[PDB]
Amino acid sequence: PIDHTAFTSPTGCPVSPRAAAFDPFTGPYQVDPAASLRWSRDEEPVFYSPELGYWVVTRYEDVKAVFRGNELFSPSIALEKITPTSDEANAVLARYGYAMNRTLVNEDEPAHMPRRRALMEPFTPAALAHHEPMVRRLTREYVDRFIDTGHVDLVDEMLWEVPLTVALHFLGVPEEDMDTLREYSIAHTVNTWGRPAPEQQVAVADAVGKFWQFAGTVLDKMRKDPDGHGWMPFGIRVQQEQPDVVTDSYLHSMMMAGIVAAHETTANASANALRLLLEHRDVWEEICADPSLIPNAVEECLRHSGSVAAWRRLVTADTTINGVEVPAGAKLLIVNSSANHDERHFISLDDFDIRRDNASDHLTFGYGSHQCMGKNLARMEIQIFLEELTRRLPHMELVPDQEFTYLPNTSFRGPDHVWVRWDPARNPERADPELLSRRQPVKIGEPSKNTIARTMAVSGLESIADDILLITLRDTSGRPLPKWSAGSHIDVDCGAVSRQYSLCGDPHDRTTFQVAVLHDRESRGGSRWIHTELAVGATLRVRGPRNHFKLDPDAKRYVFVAGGIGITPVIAMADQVKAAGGDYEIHYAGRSRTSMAFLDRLARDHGESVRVYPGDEGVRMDLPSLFADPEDGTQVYSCGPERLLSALSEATAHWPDDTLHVEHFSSTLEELDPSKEHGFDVVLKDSGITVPVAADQTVLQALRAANIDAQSDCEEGICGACEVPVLDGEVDHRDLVLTKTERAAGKTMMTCCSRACGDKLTLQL
Ligand code: HEM
Ligand SMILES: Cc1cc2nc3c(=O)[nH]c(=O)nc-3n(C[C@H](O)[C@H](O)[C@H](O)COP(=O)(O)O)c2cc1C
Ligand code: FES
16 A cells, blocks of 8 residues: 555645655754745645644745635644643643733634734834834944944844844833843743753743733733823723723733734844845945835845744635645644745745845735734834944954854744954944934835835036926936836935926936926925935935826827926927927916026927917916817827916817826815715735725725735825725726726726725725
């Protein structure tokens, strides 16, 4: 028989050599788990492992599919200890009378979701903004102790400690009470996910029992100051609001559950990223140049080298997973580390590419119902760790010929030590001391696609009209800029905000972009900043050309009407048409000829074809005359203040439907007024959850309330950064970016202002 020849799975099927040689505790999976299962991604995506007791799942679609089906794959076993707790160690636990409830990571439905939704808000990026000064304080309090040595183990002296303290601060525990809770804070990787000796088991049960009853007093102490900062005081108020949802046992569990979910995973992530970066030192020095790429950098590290090598689910019914039959009761080892390295979803994957537009898809934080709530707390934490160490010690390198040891376990991965040298005298810090007052705002919660950007340099500022600059933006990389058609714009960070400005430069010049910003007399801050505090030699983050003002090139004729600074996109459209060799007519109005940019440019070219109508002299553009009656072929693109765009739309109402195209520089909306608006449900098919949107609530607000990744720049319906695909349902379109045909197809929606017409929509999210 075959049982005389090879091992057999619990389903009676034979087991492969490579599958039976799988060991998560030693050898190839401890050195590099992702590479150690390359053979499984290629030829056997799902197998039974004899060494450990689980079925192993290796490819990214599959382990994402396990995360979403939370009815079929239960997190019951999420922190089940690999080897069982001995009678001795249970007796030690019982002596402190410790009884922890399953707290969000183990909880099945229907208990898990109400507790997650109730306890979610402090984890959102908006709520985390309060804690950003605290982590910057703690990150530096540590680094300046070893700053002058030129030699440190980052792990023990910096990265093992800091995530523990901020977790205590995130939880809301008094600083008086913190130093002991840390004394009782220990590593759990080998005791939960490894093969510990009986002595190890008890030493954990002793430290965990000590911590359980001390945290019991701490909860009683803060029990009567509920209205203060922290997750636990936030938890107390929901108890009075929902006494059955949130129980005295639960927040006592929430005390330990909180900082064991937060300490080692973040420390290991920090250590991995620093080891991973100091291995490719060119990309290290890139981060040292500008810290603008830190946010996506830490995302590529989390994909490439996460703190979670694998995770676990309990199969609840007989299923098949990618052709392999899996029985009810089977335990799954879903290798997040292999998933992050699956060629079917990422491309050139074992490459460490921090500008990767794909990093955000890694499963290091999990996926779906139980996705890590503190992911943005950890994202912020890593980002600041990695800005201070790139700011102060860019001349830091790894001690060569260094061997990195990682504790034998199935799920957690982080070096025992990372040893780094640097030249102490050479710190940029001691000659500055200006770099420290520099603080870069955290950017968390946004997908990697929406945060990729080129940091260009300003090579020249030219005044071409009153209150109008012409900015010349140079790419410092040296590598050529994208091709862009007329009407295209860019999103440039004007200080703490981003604005978009059309491109009026030369397209055939592909070492530069040119924009002509106007000083808005009533300026919410973006236009002022450019005029008031930008000089030559600065560098601005600028996110590649998009275009909502594209021209159909097969039209008979183009007549362009332009008001004020609306001259910028049209003049590039005028240039395309002169190149084509096509009839066009351009009409340019403005308050004053002195304040009308590009008349010089408009005189040297298109001068035979331009007519000017400056207001100050008194010659005005009367659209009624111009568009008195149409012609079949003529199209009209136009851009300027809303008053002329509106009035023009009136004058061109006589014409065929697709005749007029406009680009708005301002937004109309809005008034929310739920009274006129109805709530609905939005379900996220990829994630496998339904988020409710209230009448007073935008779709965008509900997504960030579930801490789903989203980027929003304008939220006035004008910029386009919040677009997301619609699989089902018809949408109440309220943006100004999508063409009336794009709104018809219903394939897409703007997260911040558009809604449902109706009861539900399905989004690819
Ligand atoms: C980079 C460091 C971190 C990694 C790699 C990580 C990974 C995870 C993973 C894989 C899960 C389970 C996912 C699932 O079963 O869908 C998880 C659940 C969780 N994480 Fe983390 N996490 C980190 C930092 C944190 C921090 C700092 C907190 C804040 C205290 C945190 C709070 C949680 C909570 C509360 C859950 C359970 C939520 C639920 O099951 O609804 N995590 N985390
Ligand atoms: C030359 C120029 C081009 C602009 N192009 C666009 C654009 O293509 N899309 C857009 O939404 N806004 C555009 N704007 C408007 C700006 O984004 C912004 O609202 C304006 O300059 C004022 O910023 P502030 O009110 O924050 O000071 C443009 C403004 C200027 C001066
Ligand atoms: S955020 Fe710019 S359109 Fe929604």
